[PDB]
Assembly symmetry: D2
């Protein structure tokens, strides 16, 4: 029986103690507290020594899957995710349509803050974020010669492209330390996204295919890669931001952060019903970023 | 302007007048009234003969895309979607992970109502219950088909994509209750790049160790879905449940979901569970023009 | 074990059968089906003969409380609620701030449909509804002489005003068969609303009190009235639209229709998670309106 | 304009920089950054001395109204609210049914964490658990006070309103953990016309048969709350949880709730559970200026 009790500001302001007190505050603050515990248990299992997939990445004592929706990549959470990937704190990335190109585009031009007329200035609104159309034009220019090389390598060097191999290539090509995908390919963290071509990147692949036909993207090889990662893990952890990212039907540790409801049936595990833009950086602050020394 | 006024039940229970009166009721009832008009405009456009200049599955005056999340296929809305597809009322289907297998499995065994399990072997989707045995029955049915598909790839040069696989599964289920049976029979393509994210995917995965090499290309499906939009005279969209399609326009569009805008996740949005709204929408729109589609 | 099955439009369009099939469709459609059952069981218990509070209203075999938020009174649901009250199908009304005056004002001037600049034309927006400010001005003019009479009767005829007695008086004064509150006082259905003065009606009572001081509105007498209604019922039914209307901590039958979530802890019973503007008229169509003959 | 950029944890865990960076992070993080600015503007205004012309519980340069739903008083946010009230950082409280008694009951017995009962005697509020015995303890404490209040009404001519009752309950609880103890001690009025809708109301009801005639007038409270706004130099509002106050303006305003607009139920709205957000907001605003309020 733990008693409900909030942080007492008559102590002054200690941010560690403030965040610890969320555990006893109730409602989603308590879920936040439980999420910190689950992620710290993931991390501690990951750091336990081993003494013991078609993948280069060395096995650890806990394989952590980080899933996220595109919109979080458009947000500043992109920096949070990049940090984790940069320091090898997760093992596999999963995302949805848009989630690749929104990272790469931010390397060529910035996304801006607006609010919750726009079409005439040439601007794509995503919540309270603004991406000028010019950004997609710059990305297109950058992308075309890479797709040319990709088709050539497929037809002459036997390369069998999948979304994950394409995402590694694009990460390598962007060659920029602010990119999630640059760091992911550098650290051999595979990125999975069958819905890679559903949005803007798809549109460009589509037009490119009439200029230079031939590109094939197989999803069955990626299917084998992602599932083998899970089957041959000693333990698995999952952290999933935004929902609609991953399917069930076991994970040893699981945290979900989203604002989706269960009532229209839309797809000790912990859910925090909150905007990940608020919650994820706090969660990282109290977990992965506390163990920064151990990952180096 | 138009005055707010609900239906007056002193007039008795006149269902058509009641549904019409939603338009002036306000909030999401008003949006439902607008959805009805939007869908009726699509249908009117569709039934319009192509003029001499507009000429080109045969193209109509309005190409209608129907998108839905897999949860709706688990629900009884599966029957509503099947009705529209059976009667050629839509031209293209788009769905999400689970959206295919959940239709096929219901031909082999029923889904049940529970409430809002792991030991009895039950998969819970909201208040719906699918016994785990349903998926075992599906596995048995599917494996021989996957053998045939790999054989045809390797010896007949068939290049599989998700749409072609879904067409083939529909032909193989050969059951008039199935959405996918009717889609392939009527040459309505089904697009679903996340086809392998769920249980069907687990099965294709395991199958690939006994009999490797199946390739599912998404790029040919990318070209097919986009060309449907590009060569349409007019386009209509009806998207149920959210997370199905991406923008960056349709001439007519209706979205029905309870997704929020605040975390960043004349078109009409109805903020409601599609399980309530979509059959009412269909009753006032497609079902009124049933004979025109026969 | 009931099997999931939707309405089959190859039968054509039978609206009764369509609505019955919601029961087996799943998700909130199934909850809708369960709500129809609960309300029909309320009604059937109400119609059972008796052979057996400080209130004139005769006891029946089930006392039905109908609760609703103001916004539903601004909507066309006002007509649905009025119908029930007109035909004595419920016994007690409960509402929130705004819920009284939005009915009365619609008797003097209409509310309009807008969408989800407005201040300069003089317009109060409520979701996609528009109420011109002029409507509140007309209501104020109408209200002042009634408040004058009310203060006089308090100080000379011993009248002890409560929100429910005030609401009866206003219903009687509006004298219009489109008003919920006209019908409620005519049929001796009490209306409870401690938060009666939180909005526009309150503002006007506030200004009036400097022109004609003295008005007292006691909530303790109303507290006694509403609770005695419940204590001395043979059976109770509750139908509550919009949430935040009533408090718990027993009802024999209960239906709630709202879109509030349980996750931030905001306050066989059935919940339908839906906009009552869609759901309530359908529910009425399949329940109270089917038994219209028996209530006359 | 401002570029989207999250906090970079390569800089280490610098909490102040992290909270500041929410402003450029986007979605509701950006709204949190705007709430911080809005509340800091209120506080800055409040600490501004009244000029010679502006002169008139003593009035300040900004009158701040703090509103909250009772669920927040059941939560640990009760401590946060109590802190602000204890230190005269707000001028008026407004709450909803349950909002009073749930503070008072915690002085007699604790609330507990459970998960998202009727036989053990437990009231469930989300993932919070209040044993039914807590309310029995509250009843015992309250009855003698209700006797005194009726006596003073009838023999001393006291005219009770909810605010006066809440002040009196706060004085009687005489406990520094209580929001209402500090409100009456600092002459912060508490308004709550729905005071009797819940458990306190059940108790006043039963008490009224043994000892009848208590009158709680809301009209005098109506005048008091409105006059606080009318005579303010500047007004600020902080409203947690929704359904608390009605409009038809404040100079500064922040709302924190997860209510939707679609059913119809420079001000800033943060769409989030206040149990996460409000203590962070307070840490960056009122708690930085603690000494100015002492
Ligand atoms: N059902 C198993 C489940 C899972 C989750 C986590 C670890 C292991 C297994 N799963 C595997 C397949 C998958 C794909 C995907 C990607 C590229 C090609 N094909 C499919 C995207 S999401 C998703 C998914 O959820
Ligand atoms: N961005 C354009 C947009 C669109 C929608 C509707 C008509 C035209 C164009 N689009 C096209 C591609 C697509 C796929 C998909 C399917 C199979 C392979 N690759 C991709 C699933 S959803 C989706 C989508 O939203
Ligand atoms: N807790 C008992 C509960 C209840 C509900 C239903 C039937 C009986 C009892 N209750 C009674 C009191 C009440 C008031 C109110 C109204 C005018 C004056 N004072 C209080 C508004 S809502 C509300 C409420 O929920
Ligand atoms: N409509 C004006 C609005 C307002 C808010 C803030 C400052 C000024 C004015 N208002 C004033 C009245 C009020 C009551 C209340 C309390 C005790 C007795 N009667 C009514 C509770 S909430 C509420 C409210 O919202």
């Amino acid at each position: 029986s733990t008693q409900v009790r909030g942080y007492d500001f008559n102590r002054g302001v200690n941010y560690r103690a403030l965040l610890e007190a969320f555990g006893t505050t109730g409602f989603q603050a308590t879920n936040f507290g439980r999420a910190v515990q689950q992620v710290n248990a993931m991390i501690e299992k990951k750091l336990e020594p081993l003494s013991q997939t078609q993948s280069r990445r060395p096995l650890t004592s806990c394989t952590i899957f980080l899933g996220y929706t595109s919109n979080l990549i458009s947000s500043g959470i992109r920096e949070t995710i990049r940090y984790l990937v940069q320091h090898n704190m997760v093992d596999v990335l999963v995302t949805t349509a848009g989630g690749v190109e929104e990272d790469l585009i931010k390397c060529l031009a910035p996304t801006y803050l607006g609010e919750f007329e726009l079409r005439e200035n040439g601007i794509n609104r995503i919540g309270n974020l603004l991406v000028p159309n010019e950004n997609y034009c710059k990305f297109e220019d950058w992308l075309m010669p890479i797709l040319d090389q990709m088709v050539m390598e497929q037809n002459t060097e036997g390369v069998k492209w999948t979304p994950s191999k394409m995402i590694a290539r694009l990460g390598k090509e962007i060659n920029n330390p602010e990119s999630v995908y640059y760091w992911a390919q550098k650290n051999h963290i595979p990125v999975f996204s069958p819905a890679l071509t559903d949005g803007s990147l798809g549109d460009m692949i589509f037009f490119h295919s009439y200029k230079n036909p031939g590109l094939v993207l197989d999803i069955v090889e990626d299917l084998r890669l992602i599932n083998t990662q899970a089957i041959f893990a000693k333990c698995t952890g999952m952290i999933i931001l935004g929902g609609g990212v991953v399917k069930h039907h076991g994970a040893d540790y699981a945290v979900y952060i989203n604002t989706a409801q269960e009532f229209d049936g839309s797809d000790q595990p912990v859910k925090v019903y909150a905007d990940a833009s608020l919650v994820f950086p706090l969660l990282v602050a109290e977990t992965f970023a506390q163990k920064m020394d151990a990952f180096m």
